[PDB]
């Protein structure tokens, strides 16, 4: 198969593994909750978003341990949680096509096949607070229980750039997808023009949203000496303006750390700052 330098994860068996997990399910999981429903919650809901148009599937993600297969998927999910969502976002759009190929009268077969969807695994495992966050927890899922305090308005992100030098007309749009904007040093739109002054027409290329939110843990069974400390949030999608400040929270997020510039005007840097990146809140 295709093995990556970065991860150790597989190829699209999980697509095939999801489909037999999803379609041949109809109920499971009674064995842990043995007290003593003929169709799975996901199956009817998969038809529901098809006729609502929404882009969000709130996956319980506590089924791969309640299914005989998908164990290695399940433990890769708690171990490479940036690639495996990017694999799973390809499946749901294609699994939507797997219901679209049945009846060809279903919303003209183009427009619900252009806007992307996304998934939301949540309630995965459990944590207990903040005095357990060890440095080895680099790319894992964390299940916090705390309190939101205050917010900020949205600052924008750099998802696409724009350029134009002083020729008559040049509307290129360079992508970034990094921490590095790359630039040319030669002209364009002619066969003979020198290394010209390339200008940065900033207010033309589109930007999405982003919001940082400050959290402090709820002082839960604190031993009457310790002060509840802080951590921050970063959201990307349309979970903005729904996390208003002042309510109890249970977040479902990944982990990330960033460097800081030590001098404000140099690129020199080293006690890092971390944060979390939310995939789904509650």
């Amino acid at each position: 198969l295709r093995i990556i330098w970065g991860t150790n994860v597989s190829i699209q068996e999980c697509t095939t593994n999801f489909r037999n997990f999803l379609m041949s399910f109809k109920y499971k999981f009674r064995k842990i909750l043995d007290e003593r429903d003929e169709e799975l919650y996901y199956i009817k809901q998969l038809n529901e978003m098809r006729e609502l148009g929404t882009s969000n599937l709130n996956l319980d993600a506590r089924n791969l341990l309640a299914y005989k297969q998908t164990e290695d998927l399940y433990h890769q999910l708690l171990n490479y949680p940036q690639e495996v969502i990017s694999i799973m976002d390809q499946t749901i759009k294609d699994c939507m096509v797997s219901l679209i190929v049945d009846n060809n009268l279903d919303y003209d077969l183009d427009e619900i096949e252009t806007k992307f969807y996304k998934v939301r695994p949540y309630n995965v495992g459990s944590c207990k607070g903040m005095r357990e966050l060890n440095p080895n927890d680099i790319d894992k899922l964390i299940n916090l229980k705390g309190l939101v305090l205050r917010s900020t308005p949205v600052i924008p992100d750099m998802k696409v750039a724009f350029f134009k030098c002083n020729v008559c007309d040049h509307t290129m749009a360079v992508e970034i997808d990094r921490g590095v904007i790359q630039e040319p040093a030669r002209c364009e739109r002619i066969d003979c023009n020198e290394p010209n002054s390339m200008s940065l027409i900033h207010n033309r290329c589109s930007f999405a949203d982003k919001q940082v939110i400050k959290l402090q843990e709820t002082p839960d069974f604190v031993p009457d000496g310790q002060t509840p400390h802080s951590i921050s949030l970063c959201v990307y999608d349309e979970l903005v303006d729904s996390c208003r400040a002042g309510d109890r929270i249970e977040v479902t997020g990944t982990f990330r750390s960033i460097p800081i510039r030590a001098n404000s005007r140099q690129r020199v840097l080293s006690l890092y700052k971390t944060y979390v990146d939310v995939v789904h809140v509650k």
């Binding site: 433990h75 440095p135 680099i138 020199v268």
Partner: protein
């Protein structure tokens, strides 16, 4: 280079110590085989990451070098000379004598397992891919080192470096050594990931450039420096990587002095301490502890010319912590000692606070409230009142403060307070100034941290503009909040109140009207349950006994007497905690006996109607409180006997708490 760059020839070298750590191989057979090698096996199988290389295994190793008459230099000499140099030659001795594949890990069951071997094989196959950079030794450790000195009778055997010196005398030649200091830990920061290794990827060659981590500021390098992706017309542009960069633990703390070994002069000063390895998350604010560790100064690297000439601002680096002074689980033998001996109403009354004269009524009124218990599991949305509050008043000269507050410093989770400091605005939590780290945190007072405990207050006439709000808001159920311009979130309220109001000038005149000295009528006559008094009447027989009472404590130093065996406070604490796990349910004859009690409570209170002595006009809020303390005393003395006699103990207390002014 010239101008005194070479030094004098020193007789103390390192190669004589380098081979002496080579004979720290399997040779120490006194202390099942090589015992320090046995600990080497319980780390490689990945369950614990702290070795302990003490001085005991060095001194006994030097004890059985008493017979080999050869030149063996001293070890505790050099390791107190320059202690920090004794870890880098140490790790370069373990690797030649480390048994590597002694564990069994297949795919999972180890963090960062297949990928480091993926990384190692990606560098191992690239060790022979020409038809090259070795690992810096910091990459493959997955372990740390530690040290531990001695202050036992081995120091009195034969010969110091571990006397608990204070911070005051420490500035001399004690810089670059290993010294322990006791203190009190304050200013606990958090745990942040520090850097020890690096990995830049350029996405063209994949050759991850490694470097040692220097001080807190450093700089990335260029992209045309490598061996494959360099040296052409195209160079891969470098950037960082997270998962291929191992990160450590780090947390900062500050010490002070014991306030008993300080001289008569100056104030004590602080000191900086760090952590490494895995001693982290093991200190607390208020720990009367001591740390043993090694010494080094640090450069400042900022504004070093005009200011910062040769200032030093050192810290100490930690090595060991020796912390001090810390339910049917090998403790049931003392729970039986209360069950076999019995004696609830009197021996426990003499147990808590036996250091006064008389007043067995009030020492009994408090022990019932030190157990509490869930009032009623209401289920529906009827949040009933619990946790009644008793207030005191009167002006004795027996220093009333250390009567009540001595109970608070042994009772569980019961925080002390006073008038100054956390006033009624800072009784709850608020937002304040912080250091250069995350400001606008929610700093608290007492009630946001002492939930469901004891709020032992004094000085009730102090800061009353904020306090008079503060007492109602906890007597009112569940509105401890921060109604500021920051947030409108509200937290719980479940704590009992024990108040002691001081009178007006001189004595409270009992012939005058009461409430001449307490300023809250509405807080008292309707929202409390019971009162007391500490009035002083002249009486000859008691005071000479009270005179012998206070003079007996001076010639000796001990205070105990009067045929009472003193009881350990853990025993009743276990008895309270066991009593808090019962919660009996009342019968029907008890509510039949209180309706006749309240009628007899109604009729006589509706006879006086005067402003001479008495308070109250028989509220049901007093009626529900007398049900509250009954099941409380039925909780502590649970023999499953909720009956007429159990509540007869209850009205026995309300009649003696009342009319304490009639003398």
């Amino acid at each position: 280079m010239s101008a005194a760059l070479p030094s004098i020839q020193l007789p103390v070298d390192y190669n004589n110590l380098f081979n002496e750590i080579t004979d720290f191989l399997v040779t120490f057979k006194q202390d099942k085989g090589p015992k320090y090698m046995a600990m080497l096996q319980k780390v490689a199988n990945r369950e614990l990451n702290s070795v302990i290389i003490d001085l005991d295994d060095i001194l006994q190793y030097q004890n059985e070098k008493f017979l080999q008459g050869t030149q063996a230099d001293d070890l505790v000499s050099a390791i107190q000379q320059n202690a920090n140099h004794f870890t880098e030659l140490f790790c370069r001795a373990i690797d030649n004598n480390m048994p590597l594949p002694t564990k069994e890990i297949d795919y999972k069951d180890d963090v960062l397992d297949v990928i480091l071997n993926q990384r190692r094989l990606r560098n191992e196959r690239m060790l022979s891919d020409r038809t090259t950079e070795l690992f810096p030794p910091n990459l493959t450790r997955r372990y740390f080192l530690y040290f531990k000195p001695l202050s036992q009778n081995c120091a009195r055997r034969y010969r110091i470096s571990s006397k608990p010196l204070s911070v005051r005398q420490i500035k001399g030649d004690f810089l670059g050594q290993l010294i322990t200091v006791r203190g009190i830990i304050t200013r606990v920061s958090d745990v942040k990931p520090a850097v020890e290794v690096i990995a830049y990827t350029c996405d063209q060659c994949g050759y991850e450039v490694f470097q040692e981590v220097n001080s807190r500021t450093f700089t990335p390098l260029s992209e045309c420096t490598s061996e494959e992706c360099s040296q052409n017309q195209t160079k891969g542009q470098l950037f960082m990587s997270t998962r291929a960069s191992k990160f450590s633990a780090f947390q900062e703390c500050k010490i002070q002095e014991l306030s008993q070994q300080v001289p008569v002069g100056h104030i004590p000063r602080s000191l900086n301490i760090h952590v490494n390895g895995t001693l982290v998350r093991s200190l607390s604010p208020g720990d009367i502890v001591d740390v043993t560790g090694i010494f080094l100064p640090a450069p400042y690297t900022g504004f070093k010319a005009l200011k910062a000439g040769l200032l030093t601002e050192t810290y100490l680096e930690a090595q060991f912590v020796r912390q001090h002074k810390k339910l049917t689980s090998d403790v049931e033998e003392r729970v039986m000692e209360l069950i076999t001996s019995g004696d609830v109403y009197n021996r426990l009354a003499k147990s808590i606070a036996p250091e006064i004269y008389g007043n067995l009524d009030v020492k009994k009124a408090l022990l019932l409230l030190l157990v509490g218990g869930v009032d009623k599991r209401v289920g529906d949305g009827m949040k009933i009142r619990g946790d009644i509050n008793v207030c005191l008043m009167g002006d004795p000269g027996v220093a009333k403060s250390q009567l009540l507050k001595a109970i608070c410093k042994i009772s569980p989770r019961g925080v002390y307070t006073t008038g100054k400091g956390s006033s009624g605005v800072g009784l709850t939590a608020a937002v304040m100034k912080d250091p250069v780290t995350d400001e606008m945190i929610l700093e608290g007072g007492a009630l946001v941290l002492a939930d469901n405990g004891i709020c032992c207050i004094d000085e009730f006439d102090k800061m009353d503009e904020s306090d008079r709000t503060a007492i109602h808001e906890v007597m009112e159920q569940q509105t401890i909040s921060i109604s500021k311009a920051g947030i409108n979130t509200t937290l719980n309220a479940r704590t009992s109140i024990l108040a002691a109001a001081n009178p007006l000038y001189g004595r409270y005149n009992p012939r005058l009207s009461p409430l001449d000295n307490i300023n809250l009528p509405a807080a008292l006559l309707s929202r409390f349950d019971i009162l007391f008094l500490m009035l002083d009447i002249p009486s000859r027989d008691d005071d000479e006994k009270l005179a012998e009472h206070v003079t007996y404590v001076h010639m000796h130093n001990k205070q105990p007497d009067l045929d009472f065996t003193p009881v350990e406070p853990s025993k009743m604490r276990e008895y309270i905690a066991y009593a808090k796990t019962k919660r009996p349910v009342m019968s029907e004859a008890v509510n039949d006996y209180v309706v006749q009690a309240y009628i007899r409570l109604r009729q006589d209170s509706k006879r006086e109607m005067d402003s001479k002595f008495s308070f109250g006009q028989a509220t049901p809020r007093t009626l529900l409180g007398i049900i509250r303390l009954s099941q409380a005393l039925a909780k502590l003395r649970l023999a499953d006997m909720v009956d007429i006699d159990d509540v007869e103990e209850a009205l026995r207390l309300v009649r003696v708490s009342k009319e304490s002014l009639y003398q």
